[PDB]
Ligand binder design. Structure first.
Ligand SMILES: CC(C)(Sc1ccc(CCN(CCCCC2CCCCC2)C(=O)NC2CCCCC2)cc1)C(=O)O
Length: 259
């Protein structure tokens, strides 16, 4: 790992720490000992303290709206982060849009793992914790949203990545040269090759104990693509069949023509 590649890995790590409100160290500090949402009573209490304006509709629909707000926010964070990736800001604007379009939910579900344990997830900028069992207790189809994400996260967390790894993994997610509709595939593939090269060398240095960590992470990227495809299908069912579950226009555009 040359000085330029080590420097690039650190540059991406610092951009991640700057641009995402939550990181794995911060999440672990909080989780070690947030208001616990484990039933309808505590959900309603948390709404009045953490999202007061929202309740100043069915609980499931209220949760869905709050989730959309966090997704919109995360799109902003990921867009700023992408500027630290060598060559991203030099791409055609349309290609930057396409890469973020397909990458954002893969990145969201990867980063969600940092705030998940087997019992639930940290939410609302670190100020709430919503139990996995409470989410399973919601009426269909809303109880079907988070469980596959918990399943992904438990195995992803067993890899014991830190933020220096996760930042590069998120950058690699964004730099996929095989997204549909790309204009300058050749330059993107070169951008992808560079980020993946940095990721491979970083994992060799930071995880000398796990000689297969790089191919494990390539597989996780493929798993995330499938998780997002399935997630988009469920969101389409909810939007179409739930008269009160309208989609924020920015998210409508992200999901539109995706899969
Ligand atoms: C909205 C769909 C249509 S479905 C969908 C998508 C994502 C999620 C996870 C949302 N969430 C819980 C947000 C829970 C808010 C809480 C609800 C109860 C009352 C207090 C506030 C959360 O913390 N996300 C992190 C954000 C920081 C970066 C990593 C991801 C849930 C459903 C979509 O976007 O596709």
């Amino acid at each position: 790992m040359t000085a330029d590649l080590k420097s690039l890995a650190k540059r991406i790590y610092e951009a991640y720490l700057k641009n995402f409100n939550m990181n794995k160290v911060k999440a672990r500090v909080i989780l070690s000992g947030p208001f616990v949402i484990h039933d309808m009573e505590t959900l309603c209490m948390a709404e009045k303290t953490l999202v007061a304006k929202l309740v100043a509709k069915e609980a499931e629909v209220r949760i869905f709206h709050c989730c959309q707000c966090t997704s919109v926010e995360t799109v902003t964070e990921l867009t700023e982060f992408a500027k630290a990736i060598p060559g991203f800001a030099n791409l055609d604007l349309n290609d930057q849009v396409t890469l973020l379009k397909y990458g954002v939910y893969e990145a969201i579900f990867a980063m969600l793992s940092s705030v998940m344990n087997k019992d639930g997830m940290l939410v609302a900028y670190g100020n709430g914790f919503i139990t996995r069992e409470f989410l399973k207790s919601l009426r269909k189809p809303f109880c079907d949203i988070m469980e596959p994400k918990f399943d992904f996260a438990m195995k992803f967390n067993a890899l014991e990545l830190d933020d220096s790894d996760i930042s590069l993994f998120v950058a690699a997610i964004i730099c996929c040269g095989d997204r549909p509709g790309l204009l300058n595939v050749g330059h993107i593939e070169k951008m992808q090759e560079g980020i993946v090269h940095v990721l491979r060398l970083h994992l060799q240095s930071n995880h000398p104990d796990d000689i297969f960590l790089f191919p494990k992470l390539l597989q996780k990227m493929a798993d995330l693509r499938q998780l997002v495809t399935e997630h988009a299908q469920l969101v389409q069912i909810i939007k179409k069949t739930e008269s009160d579950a309208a989609l924020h226009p920015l998210l409508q555009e992200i999901y539109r023509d995706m899969y």
